[PDB]
């Protein structure tokens, strides 16, 4: 009565199978096995206990040749919210006015182009500000350095809190640059640069010892094609600095409708689980709506990480369809932005840092 | 100086500054251009609105460039959206919790619903009669039912359709009808889902709307044998060229880890990312409970069968994987351990998914 059936089984489950079976084909992630129908339910019970996946009945699709051919992806069974008190206390320390002041200063450069002296001055000033902040709060485990940009004279600025911690890092970024000409660059990406500077200040003023280093990075030459972030990613590979997760803040201040506080999670060139985690952090800690959008190839600095398979996510001020119409112009000015919106992005950065760096 | 840029085809087609093609493939060109022209390309890219470019100069020339190429996201494509509030909210108001509980009472009274048993067969026959009686009761005339065979397994899959003549990629809502052998009431798995989608089918059958797409309600056979029925159904649709736009799977809609916490879970493994995000929005907008995310592994449930053929498929579920019902696959998987409000919420989700997607 009992028939032969063929099952595609993940290796993690296949290794524990003890009913009689023949292996028909195999690869790194799967075996295809032949077993009796009367023993299949035994494999269900086993799968339940092992908790690394179940199996797919492939009898219909078939033998060793077919089976091998059939084989030419098994998911591991994390990002959670486990630090409410610490996050909520840190969110209470964010000072909106600090964001506004940083943005005032950044937007007063004629531009912040990676080919210009003003571009260079921007990088120097961000570096100093972070350094002064580390001294102000007595934070002793910090370090700063430039990562060069080839023929572009503006370097990327890399900063770290927990310089000696040997674990995959958590990275928070923005880009410091603009196009040439008169470019205040308030929204893109003065706003993100300023939002993450205030989040850095909050981490710097805490006395927590995290389980992972935390980087704050301001990339050079994003406008030129992600130049600075490509140099940073390469710098990390060449110094074997592992990275667990990256968030990008690029445009944190323009609201399509002042009364709608929705934050947008970008779904192209980003890590799916990390993106979902941002959606949760927004809902749990920021208490505003979340919606989804795509911004295209080469959209911002997260893409540089995503290309090297490092988990990276991108929350943004608007959808792509409704983006700030003044970006890349002399009209990209701070009065058109919303400080609450900028503050909310800063809160997100802080919550991402504290949750992920504490595990 | 010159610079090399990796450009999507859509943008590359519009470039009129001087440039040399160094390499190209189906989705991209790498071009060489003067540095003085790069900002021109930024402006162009902003206007063309199909993506920007990556500066690859650091990584390079034609050999490196071709080697570098060995894709491009679409930005003006249709998006899953919420555009049918009034119709959805009225249909949600028609869902009757009690009908769900009654269906579940009947399904759980079979000794089991194993695909190798007569009780498995009787389950499929009863579901088919129930859908058919419901279609006649409301005078819905554009419906049709059929069994899809399951090879050696005697339980067929039940495929049902509302809008049988409509020539457009369909919307599919599923659950599995089966259990293990022995005494398996299978309340949670997957009596609950089977019942939640039966009540959603009733609501669509009782409406008078003419949708722009056929709507399928499917109860798969032999899910517990490794997705056997779903595979037969997917193959049936491929061999008959019945196109499918989007699929949702309801597997376990009734157990709450904490009775007071009504969170619904979107499964991120073996599912379509955009459709999964859309479910999160449907949950938040129409159901008004929290959403959280979890993975359940290879061969989890019938959505995987669709996902393998690149048909967009999504899987909302009653708990996380870690916090899943502890009575599953046992005789204790009983109705009394379930929560009817949770089952009703899943039924609402099915109704909202059908009406939103089938109306576009
Ligand atoms: Zn930007
Ligand atoms: Zn920009
Ligand atoms: Zn199930
Ligand atoms: Zn099951």
């Amino acid at each position: 009565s009992p028939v032969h059936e063929q099952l595609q089984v993940p290796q993690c489950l296949a290794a524990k199978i003890t009913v009689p079976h023949k292996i028909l084909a195999e690869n790194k992630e799967f075996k295809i096995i032949d077993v009796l129908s009367s023993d299949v339910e035994t494999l269900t019970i086993l799968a339940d206990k092992v908790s690394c996946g179940h199996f797919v009945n492939v009898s219909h699709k078939l033998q060793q040749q077919s089976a091998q051919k059939l084989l030419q992806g098994v998911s591991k069974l994390v990002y959670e919210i486990k630090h409410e008190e610490e996050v909520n206390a840190a969110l209470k320390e964010i000072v909106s006015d600090n964001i506004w002041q940083t943005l005032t200063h950044m937007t007063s450069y004629y531009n912040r182009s990676a080919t210009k002296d003003t571009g260079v001055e921007t990088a120097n000033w961000l570096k100093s500000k972070f350094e002064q902040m580390a001294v102000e709060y007595g934070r002793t485990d910090t370090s700063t350095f430039f990562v060069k940009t080839g023929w572009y004279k503006q370097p990327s600025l890399v900063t770290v809190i927990g310089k000696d911690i040997k674990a995959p890092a958590i990275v928070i970024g923005a880009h410091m640059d603009t196009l040439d000409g008169r470019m205040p660059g308030a929204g893109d990406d003065g706003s993100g640069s300023s939002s993450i500077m205030e989040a850095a200040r909050v981490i710097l003023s805490s006395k927590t010892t995290f389980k992972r280093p935390i980087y704050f990075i301001w990339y050079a030459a994003e406008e030129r094609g992600l130049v600075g972030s490509q140099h940073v990613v390469q710098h990390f590979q060449e110094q074997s600095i592992p990275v667990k997760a990256v968030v990008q803040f690029d445009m944190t201040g323009y609201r399509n409708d002042a009364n709608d506080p929705t934050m947008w999670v970008f779904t192209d060139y980003t890590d799916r689980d990390l993106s979902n985690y941002l959606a949760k952090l927004i809902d749990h800690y920021i208490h505003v709506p979340v919606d989804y959008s795509r911004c295209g190839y080469g959209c911002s600095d997260h893409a540089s990480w995503n290309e090297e398979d490092i988990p990276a996510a991108f929350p943004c001020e608007t959808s792509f369809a409704d983006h700030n119409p003044y970006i890349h112009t002399s009209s990209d000015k701070m009065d058109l932005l919303n400080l609450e919106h900028m503050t909310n992005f800063s809160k997100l950065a802080v919550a991402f840092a504290i949750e992920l760096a504490s595990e």
Side-chain angles (χ1 to χ4, degrees), chain A:
Chain A
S1 180
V3 303
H4 291 77
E5 314 194 68
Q6 302 76 48
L7 308 185
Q8 190 162 147
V9 192
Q11 287 277 8
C12 57
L13 182 54
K16 299 296 183 181
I17 293 170
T18 58
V19 301
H21 65 290
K22 300 175 249 298
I23 305 320
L24 300 184
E26 226 186 327
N27 76 14
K28 211 180 161 193
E29 298 78 23
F30 302 100
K31 293 190 189 157
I32 291 169
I33 63 170
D34 183 278
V35 295
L36 286 181
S37 53
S38 50
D39 289 328
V40 167
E41 196 157 291
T42 296
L43 305 182
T44 298
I45 297 319
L46 179 71
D48 289 340
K49 179 62 173 171
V50 168
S51 295
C52 77
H54 288 258
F55 59 76
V56 170
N57 195 314
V58 293
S59 307
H60 188 47
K61 288 180 194 217
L62 316 183
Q63 280 213 326
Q64 301 181 234
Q65 186 173 355
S66 64
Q68 272 306 352
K69 276 166 172 199
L70 200 53
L71 293 181
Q72 81 202 350
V74 180
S75 64
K76 298 292 180 65
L77 320 179
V78 296
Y79 309 115
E80 293 177 350
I81 298 168
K82 303 181 165 228
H83 296 271
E84 277 185 67
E85 292 179 62
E86 183 178 2
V87 172
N88 279 317
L91 295 188
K92 275 186 72 131
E93 309 262 355
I94 292 288
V95 179
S96 289
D97 181 68
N98 284 353
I99 291 164
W100 192 257
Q101 292 329 129
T102 299
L103 187 56
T104 297
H105 184 277
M106 285 190 82
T107 60
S108 80
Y109 295 105
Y110 182 74
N111 64 50
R112 313 182 299 273
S113 179
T115 60
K116 304 291 211 279
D117 292 331
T118 53
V120 180
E121 293 159 23
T122 299
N124 286 339
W125 182 78
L126 297 168
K127 176 162 200 287
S128 287
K129 183 190 183 69
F130 179 95
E131 276 161 10
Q132 288 167 27
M133 281 186 174
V135 169
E136 183 178 2
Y137 305 108
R139 191 83 193 196
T140 66
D141 66 340
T142 59
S143 174
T144 66
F145 58 91
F146 288 137
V147 169
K148 276 153 177 199
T149 325
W151 66 277
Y152 291 96
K153 56 174 83 157
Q154 180 186 73
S156 299
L157 173 55
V158 180
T159 74
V160 63
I161 301 157
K163 71 198 195 183
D164 298 311
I165 303 185
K166 293 179 179 179
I170 297 314
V171 174
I172 295 100
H175 71 96
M176 71 177 74
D177 69 311
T178 71
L179 297 188
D180 294 307
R182 179 53 194 130
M183 298 286 167
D188 173 27
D189 186 25
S191 63
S193 294
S194 306
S195 297
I196 70 165
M197 180 64 78
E198 170 66 8
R201 191 196 67 72
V202 172
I203 305 312
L204 287 174
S205 73
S206 64
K207 186 200 306 186
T208 313
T209 288
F210 296 103
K211 294 286 304 301
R212 302 171 176 285
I214 298 156
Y215 291 88
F216 292 85
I217 309 186
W218 295 258
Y219 310 106
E222 189 279 348
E223 299 291 5
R224 306 289 300 178
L226 324 183
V227 188
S229 52
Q230 280 169 101
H231 283 264
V232 175
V233 172
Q234 196 175 119
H235 184 276
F236 276 56
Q237 293 177 335
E238 291 168 349
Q239 313 289 148
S240 307
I241 299 166
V243 176
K244 176 162 178 158
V246 182
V247 60
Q248 172 66 3
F249 295 89
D250 192 356
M251 311 184 315
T252 65
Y254 177 88
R255 277 183 182 176
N256 213 57
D257 169 4
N259 299 135
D260 184 357
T262 298
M263 302 168 73
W264 292 85
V265 172
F266 278 69
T267 64
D268 56 352
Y269 308 101
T270 55
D271 181 69
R272 182 181 183 170
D273 298 330
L274 191 63
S275 303
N276 288 331
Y277 188 62
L278 289 195
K280 275 161 83 159
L281 291 171
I282 289 158
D283 178 64
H284 200 106
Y285 291 113
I286 315 302
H287 300 117
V288 299
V290 179
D291 205 340
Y292 308 92
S293 184
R294 298 175 175 180
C295 58
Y297 181 71
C299 176
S300 199
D301 303 297
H302 55 290
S304 301
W305 297 97
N306 178 250
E307 267 174 25
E308 297 298 311
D309 296 300
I310 289 164
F314 178 35
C316 190
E317 64 186 22
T318 60
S319 72
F320 180 79
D322 296 306
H323 69 70
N324 178 349
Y326 307 107
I327 69 178
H328 298 167
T329 75
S330 304
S331 300
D332 181 5
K333 291 165 147 155
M334 59 194 289
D335 299 358
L336 300 154
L337 309 178
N338 181 286
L339 179 55
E340 177 184 286
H341 216 215
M342 295 189 279
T343 300
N344 281 167
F345 286 93
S346 195
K347 286 195 212 296
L348 185 47
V350 172
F352 185 87
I354 293 165
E355 286 284 345
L356 298 181
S358 304
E359 299 295 280

